[PDB]
Amino acid sequence: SPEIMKDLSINFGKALDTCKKELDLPDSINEDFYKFWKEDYEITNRLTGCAIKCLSEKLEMVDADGKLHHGNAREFAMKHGADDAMAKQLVDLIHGCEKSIPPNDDRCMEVLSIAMCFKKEIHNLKWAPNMEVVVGEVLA
Ligand SMILES: CC/C=C\C=C/CCCCCCCCCCO
């Protein structure tokens, strides 16, 4: 649902300021986060990719091989309202995106591709929340 996806989004984005500090990222990536869920908006900036990658790592959603950690991704989804079924459906979308994307050895670009593919799948299911929810109040 969009309600669960909003809650996941807010919690995924809560470390954005911490990640910008760690990676010394410029404020030019902010607009990409404010528009993250805007239908048909494509994020292209690799640095935004590095931020998304950092956010995923903060939630321990990257395994030892650079792929989705399914158990921890499920833990995160369920904490914020997903049942077993939704957790598995979300994890299957991400895994499918990993398998579908143009391969890229730049992990910031790889994460950006997976995030854009996932966003499209969530729009396809009509589960997208309002465009700016990943940011919530983190940048205020
Ligand atoms: C799990 C996503 C839930 C809410 C908001 C945004 C997620 C989009 C990025 C999905 C992460 C894909 C690759 C990094 C995650 C772990 O490898």
The resolution in angstroms reads: 1.9
Give me ligand 1 centre to Cα 112, in Å. Answer: 10
Q: Which of 92, 91, 93, 133 is nearest to 117 (CA)?
A: 93
Taking a C-beta distance cutoff of 8 angstroms, is the pair 112, 46 a contact? yes
Q: State the DSSP string of 104-134.
A: -SSHHHHHHHHHHHHHHHHHHTT----TTTT
CATH number, residue 69:
1.10.238.20
Six token digits for residue 10: 């807010």
Q: What is the CA radius of gyration of the chain?
A: 14
Cα dist from 62 to 57, 58, 106, whole Å: 6, 9, 15
**Helices 46-58 and 2-13, interaxial angle, to 10°?**
100
Q: Which atom of ligand 1 is nearest to the CA of 111?
A: 13
| Segments forming the whole domain that contains residue 71 | 1-140
Give me ligand 1 centre to Cα 140, in Å. Answer: 23
Residue nearest ligand 1's atom 10 by CA: 115
Spatial CB neighbours of 122, under 8 Å, sequence gap ≥ 6: 5, 93, 128
- Spell out which residues line ligand 1, taking CB within 6 angstroms: 8-9, 12, 52, 56, 61-62, 68, 94, 111, 114-115, 118
- Which segments of 35-83 does DSSP mark as H helices, in order? 46-58, 70-79
Residue nearest ligand 1's atom 11 by CA: 115
For 39, half-sphere exposure in the C-beta direction (CA atoms, 13 angstrom radius) is 9
Cα dist from 94 to 10, 18, 88, 100, 118, whole Å: 18, 24, 10, 10, 6
Q: Whole-angstrom Cα distance, residue 55 to residue 70? A: 16
Q: Whole-angstrom Cα distance, residue 138 to residue 140? A: 6
Total domains in the chain come to 1
